[PDB]
Amino acid sequence: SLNCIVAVSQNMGIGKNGDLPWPPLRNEFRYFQRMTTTSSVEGKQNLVIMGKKTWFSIPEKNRPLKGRINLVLSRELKEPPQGAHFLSRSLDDALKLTEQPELANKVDMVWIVGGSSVYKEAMNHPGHLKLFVTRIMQDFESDTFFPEIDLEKYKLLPEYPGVLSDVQEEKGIKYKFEVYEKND
Numbered sequence: 001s002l003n004c005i006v007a008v009s010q011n012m013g014i015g016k017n018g019d020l021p022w023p024p025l026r027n028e029f030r031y032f033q034r035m036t037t038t039s040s041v042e043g044k045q046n047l048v049i050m051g052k053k054t055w056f057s058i059p060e061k062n063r064p065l066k067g068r069i070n071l072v073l074s075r076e077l078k079e080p081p082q083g084a085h086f087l088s089r090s091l092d093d094a095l096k097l098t099e100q101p102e103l104a105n106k107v108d109m110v111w112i113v114g115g116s117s118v119y120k121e122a123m124n125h126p127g128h129l130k131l132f133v134t135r136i137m138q139d140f141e142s143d144t145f146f147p148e149i150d151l152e153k154y155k156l157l158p159e160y161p162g163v164l165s166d167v168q169e170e171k172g173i174k175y176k177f178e179v180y181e182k183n184d
């Protein structure tokens with residue numbers, strides 16, 4: 001299945017000057033690490049698809065995201081950024097690549113991890129799509145925003161395996177984990 005994962009502020013912001021609009025939330029990042037890294041199929045890895053700015057928004061010491069196959073999207077870059085496993089010129093080229101048997105046999109989940117335009121194209125992609133959305137319950141100054149969630153297609157699930165639905169809090173900031181789903 002194809003999955004998006006994101007943390008959004010109340011104003012639906014996701015980035016500010018190539019970083020997150022809020023201070024580091026240690027447990028929310030752990031959640032991101034766990035969901036993207038954990039495969040539900042023994043012996044297979046997970047694969048993350050991300051835009052170019054998101055890739056460089058990750059501290060160099062954490063690149064590539066360990067335990068996961070990192071794929072970057074770019075139309076300008078000649079070579080893949082140092083540390084990336086794959087480069088693709090479009091979202092669909094990347095998805096077509098994950099379906100190649102040499103990959104599919106080693107890959108379980110595909111995770112879209114940003115940025116904005118990558119989120120938008122994926123959420124309108126036809127098929128089975130899940131959105132793992134962390135609702136940060138506080139407005140934050142942002143220059144990049146998450147696109148609209150169409151509630152005529154996406155349904156908020158009341159629970160999901162491995163996700164705590166209770167309100168969380170770190171550094172004084174409250175947030176909750178949500179999961180939306182659509183089929184075709």
Ligand SMILES: NC(=O)c1ccc[n+]([C@@H]2O[C@H](COP(=O)([O-])OP(=O)(O)OC[C@H]3O[C@@H](n4cnc5c(N)ncnc54)[C@H](OP(=O)(O)O)[C@@H]3O)[C@@H](O)[C@H]2O)c1
Nearest residue numbers: 006007015018019051052053054073074075076114115116
């Ligand atoms: N809160 C969160 O969950 C979250 C998640 C991710 C990112 N962020 C934040 O969001 C910001 C980055 O997001 P962003 O939307 O500004 O940038 P982005 O979408 O990560 O990257 C934009 C660039 O990626 C390439 N690209 C994107 N979509 C493509 C496509 N379909 N095909 C080919 N290339 C494609 C292009 O590079 P070229 O110009 O080379 O073609 C484009 O200029 C940062 O501040 C980051 O910290 C937040």
Ligand SMILES: Nc1nc(=O)c2nc(CNc3ccc(C(=O)N[C@@H](CCC(=O)O)C(=O)O)cc3)cnc2[nH]1
Nearest residue numbers: 005006007029030032033057058062066113114134
């Ligand atoms: N829910 C969610 N939260 C985020 O913070 C998030 N961030 C991005 C993009 N930004 C980043 C920035 C840093 C790292 C990072 O350093 N990841 C490491 C360490 C996590 C940790 O232990 O804090 C990793 O292995 O996940 C990941 C994504 C994309 N989707 C997200 N989705």
